[PDB]
Structure 1
Amino acid sequence: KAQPTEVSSILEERIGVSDEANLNETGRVLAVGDGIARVFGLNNIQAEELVEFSSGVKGMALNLEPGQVGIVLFGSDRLVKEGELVKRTGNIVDVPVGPGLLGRVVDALGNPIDGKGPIDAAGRSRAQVKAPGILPRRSVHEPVQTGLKAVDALVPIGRGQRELIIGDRQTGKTAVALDTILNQKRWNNGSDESKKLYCVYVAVGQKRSTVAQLVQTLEQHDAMKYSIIVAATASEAAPLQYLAPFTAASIGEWFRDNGKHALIVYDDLSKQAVAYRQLSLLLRRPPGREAYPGDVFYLHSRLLERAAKLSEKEGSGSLTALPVIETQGGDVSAYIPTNVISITDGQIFLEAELFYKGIRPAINVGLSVSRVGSAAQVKALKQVAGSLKLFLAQYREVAAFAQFGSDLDASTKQTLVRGERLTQLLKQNQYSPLATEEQVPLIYAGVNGHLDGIELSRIGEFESSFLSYLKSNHNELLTEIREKGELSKELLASLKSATESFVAT
């Protein structure tokens, strides 16, 4: 209505700034080609200072020289014209942080693209913040319940444990962190903030239609009330795609330094490396391996180091990071991923053939591992999955061994049958997260060989059948697993009886 004209006219009153508009920055643009611009003047400019051109496009002054300063653009060069007037902000590049960012969808600069008006920001924060030192940290001791079966079973995640999701094109990578965010609805509907866990998804270099459908889907399952989307789509400039994950990392630091717990998801760092080498080659800087500048390790390094678990002295904040790396044909020896593997605290490899067999999630257990996840696994899951990874590696040993058609003893054929049941067990449809109380009895049935008499095709209906069985009947045991997160011997035997009851069908 006219209330937008009211708000815009109050902003016209601010437009008061003209009465104190004596900028000590303005200088002419010498040249501006190939995503860069040399500007004369600006003799009190700062290093990595945000400036704004006369055509409204902002920029970061990245390299300072006696004579000129090279400023990168934050958009197309079609708007910037030679010889114009370049006002400096007066600031190193900062972004809005605050709670009102939840639900909104912004650019790399916090300017919202959802069309939902301005941003209720609680402050501005620099992009290239130092990562915290070794002393205000703590080893992770709190779980991140992703809701997926084999993820929460085999590779548990601590609050702040930097875990890589690596895979290939169209291999179910995005759906993993997506359903993790959807699992976080359990406690974001709750009330304890230390149980709560806030979600920031960083879509860079991707299709705007894809991001729109993702935001749509997060509104359908109502994850949006705790979600923050950072869009750096492929139409936009390479420095925006370079810059945006640092900004979202600053947002995660805003949540972490408030004592709260937060989750950031990078998707993908691969295109960020493409944008960064696009920058560096347009900086005329020499490349190294696979035409990348040698600091690209330092790039994703200095990005991902700003994510850990704060100690109690800092208020016990945490920030967990989920990077995504698209590789080329299952290669794990390209220069870009081998850098990331040297940074993150573990790997979640998605084999293309397993999803080609429709096994979704397509987890290669033999490659995927976490380093310190076992310290923060759910204690019941830590009780019930000790033999599980051993048995699955055992079944993997006889997986390639059984292809020759040779008959075997009852031990290895037993492991073959039970590992087939466990393999067909851990499939899980999209948008179907599972609580820990739900994940425990499937593991307890899978360990104790009860699935062996069941048909291999019958396992999928058996899962939902036994779950609805327990939710109908042994709902008290579900509450016990919820409250304790730890199975006593009495809970163990009651669980055994409750299983073997429905195992009789």
Structure 2
Amino acid sequence: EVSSILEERIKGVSDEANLNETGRVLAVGDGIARVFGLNNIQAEELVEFSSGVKGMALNLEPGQVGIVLFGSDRLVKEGELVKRTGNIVDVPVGPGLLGRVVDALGNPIDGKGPIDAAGRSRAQVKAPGILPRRSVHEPVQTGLKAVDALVPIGRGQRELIIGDRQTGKTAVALDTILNQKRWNNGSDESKKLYCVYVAVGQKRSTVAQLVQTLEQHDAMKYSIIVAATASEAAPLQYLAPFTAASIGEWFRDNGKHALIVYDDLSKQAVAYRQLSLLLRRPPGREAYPGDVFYLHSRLLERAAKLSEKEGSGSLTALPVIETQGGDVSAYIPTNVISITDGQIFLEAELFYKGIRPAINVGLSVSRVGSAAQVKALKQVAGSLKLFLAQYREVAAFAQSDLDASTKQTLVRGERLTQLLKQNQYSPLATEEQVPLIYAGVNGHLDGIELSRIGEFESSFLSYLKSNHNELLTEIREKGELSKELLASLKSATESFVAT
């Protein structure tokens, strides 16, 4: 019992060894430490202090070294002996981390048993050259419309999720992970994702809610969660995306697909801000350092789709932004946006007014993220992206001209917006989403009025499988629509519209 666990521990330690170099600290505190000595230390080495706390060498100076403390101030004291770990700052990598909760140090902090690792690989690494890169081809499915192919994301994309924080920002991301569960248990290993959800600056309470929620939804057995919560000090939050991303790359160079969600990169900027100012480095534009840019660009380009050589591996990214009231005059949001391609502009105003997901499509774009989609998912959504940016202009002046043609577009457009909505935390299947967008694209929401859109949807799906599942077997396997299949669907949709 209580005697046995202690007896085990005391025996599992001895804590007798013979050392190389030591320091004795100069004057410690402010989340940065000043150490005296350490004359043979390498750069970015790991040091371990007599407190038990460990730090990463930042400034190597001729007489002193200035470590940065991974941990709260209070434990570090003055006149403690600092010993070289002898190894560069690394975090365990391997497949003994899937369904083990971890912090940014890689410790089990409730855990699901101690941590097993294939390797360790350095927190900080630099991403492969220009040459091993390849464009995306495979679609990421979120199981939510309005992103499905309306605003496309592919496998290796770095496409952004932007909006005001805590408007349900987190759910959009979970659904990506959740929806990929029957392509993630495949026998196609390129189709599996192994996902890391980096929680930076969030409440330790939320993260514990999130760990349980995933185990109910039976999805925690192919995801890792990394933690540098709000309670835990700033230099650990700074290092949190970097350390987690090393873990992501390990999946990517085994030539298998992955995902990593960086929630919230605006909080990495704050974490790095506090550490930066207490080291005497003067603030840049918007009171954030001017080296913020460096962290995000280095960080982001280690999520990239590789070529045939590297096993056609990928690590996709959905970086999650805390916007300062829907302003894009601010430094941190634009820095993440200019590195990335594609945006998933999300509206608070829309979230409140019953659009869940509230994914505005006006300031949402895809650049190179538009070759993700297979043919079925190019046909069905065809030019819906365009039509609802003709709808925006039609409603600016619907406070000039009023014509049937403009009115018709406005009615289709409203009806279409309603259609995009889907239940959250049960993301509707991709095969299931393919018929629904056909209908609306082909203008068949001139027989359904707004109040009944939800009712039609489930009754139309039930109808289609019992009548003809042939259509659906085709889209599961082929993933490309032919004209004949398309017509067969049109014929079926109109039948349902009448009665």
**Match for residue 481 of structure 2 among 474, 487, 490:** 487
1:8–1:32 distance in 2 versus 1, CA, 3 Å: farther
Deviation for aligned residue 1:115: 3.3
Check the 8 A contact 1:39/1:68 in 2, yes or no: yes
1:242–1:9 distance in 2 versus 1, CA, 3 Å: farther
Deviation for aligned residue 1:408: 2.4
Quote the residue 2:206 is aligned against: 210
Alpha-carbon distance in 2 for matches of 1:25, 1:325 = 44
Quote the residue 2:91 is aligned against: 95
1:13–1:27 distance in 2 versus 1, CA, 3 Å: farther
Deviation for aligned residue 1:435: 2.3
1:7–1:298 distance in 2 versus 1, CA, 3 Å: farther
Deviation for aligned residue 1:437: 1.3
Alpha-carbon distance in 1 for matches of 2:113, 2:348 = 42
Bigger shift: residues 426-435 or 239-248: 426-435
1:8–1:195 distance in 2 versus 1, CA, 3 Å: farther
Deviation for aligned residue 1:400: 2.1
**Match for residue 459 of structure 2 among 462, 465, 471:** 465
Alpha-carbon distance in 1 for matches of 2:6, 2:34 = 32
1:398-441 per-position Cα deviation (integer Å, ceiling 9, x unaligned): 122222xx882221111111101101111122113122211111
Check the 8 A contact 2:92/2:120 in 1, yes or no: yes
1:43-74 per-position Cα deviation (integer Å, ceiling 9, x unaligned): 11111111111111111111111111111111
> How many residue pairs align between the two structures?
498
Check the 8 A contact 1:436/1:481 in 2, yes or no: no
Deviation for aligned residue 1:467: 1.7
1:413–1:216 distance in 2 versus 1, CA, 3 Å: same
Q: Does 1:37 align with 2:33?
A: yes
Check the 8 A contact 2:165/2:321 in 1, yes or no: no
1:9–1:317 distance in 2 versus 1, CA, 3 Å: farther
Alpha-carbon distance in 1 for matches of 2:451, 2:100 = 43
Deviation for aligned residue 1:190: 2.2
1:236-287 per-position Cα deviation (integer Å, ceiling 9, x unaligned): 0101100011011101100000011100000001111001010000111111
4+ runs deviating over 6 angstroms: 6-20
1:12-61 per-position Cα deviation (integer Å, ceiling 9, x unaligned): 99999979822223210111121111011111111111111111111111
Bigger shift: residues 384-393 or 272-281: 384-393
- Kindly report which structure 2 residues correspond to 1:382-401, keeping only aligned pairs within 5 A, or say none: 382-401=378-397
The answer for unaligned runs of 5 or more in structure 1 is: 1-5
Check the 8 A contact 1:101/1:120 in 2, yes or no: yes
1:277-320 per-position Cα deviation (integer Å, ceiling 9, x unaligned): 10000111111111121110011111111111111111111000
- Kindly report which structure 2 residues correspond to 1:238-317, keeping only aligned pairs within 5 A, or say none: 238-317=234-313
Check the 8 A contact 1:383/1:487 in 2, yes or no: yes
Check the 8 A contact 1:96/1:109 in 2, yes or no: no
Check the 8 A contact 2:422/2:428 in 1, yes or no: no
Deviation for aligned residue 1:10: 13
Alpha-carbon distance in 1 for matches of 2:6, 2:89 = 23
What is the TM-score of this pair, normalised by structure 1?
0.95
1:96–1:474 distance in 2 versus 1, CA, 3 Å: same
Deviation for aligned residue 1:191: 2.3
Check the 8 A contact 1:28/1:40 in 2, yes or no: yes
Alpha-carbon distance in 1 for matches of 2:416, 2:453 = 9
Deviation for aligned residue 1:471: 2.8
How big is the alpha-carbon RMSD for the aligned residues of Structure 1 and Structure 2?
2.2
Check the 8 A contact 2:23/2:81 in 1, yes or no: yes
Bigger shift: residues 482-491 or 494-503: 494-503
Bigger shift: residues 439-448 or 20-29: 20-29
1:158–1:8 distance in 2 versus 1, CA, 3 Å: farther
Q: Does 1:12 align with 2:16?
A: no
Alpha-carbon distance in 2 for matches of 1:250, 1:327 = 27
- Kindly report which structure 2 residues correspond to 1:331-370, keeping only aligned pairs within 5 A, or say none: 331-370=327-366
Alpha-carbon distance in 2 for matches of 1:166, 1:8 = 52
1:89–1:473 distance in 2 versus 1, CA, 3 Å: farther
1:305–1:8 distance in 2 versus 1, CA, 3 Å: farther
Deviation for aligned residue 1:504: 1.8
Give secondary structure in 2 for the equivalent of 1:106.
coil
What is the TM-score of this pair, normalised by structure 2?
0.96
1:114–1:461 distance in 2 versus 1, CA, 3 Å: farther
Deviation for aligned residue 1:454: 1.1
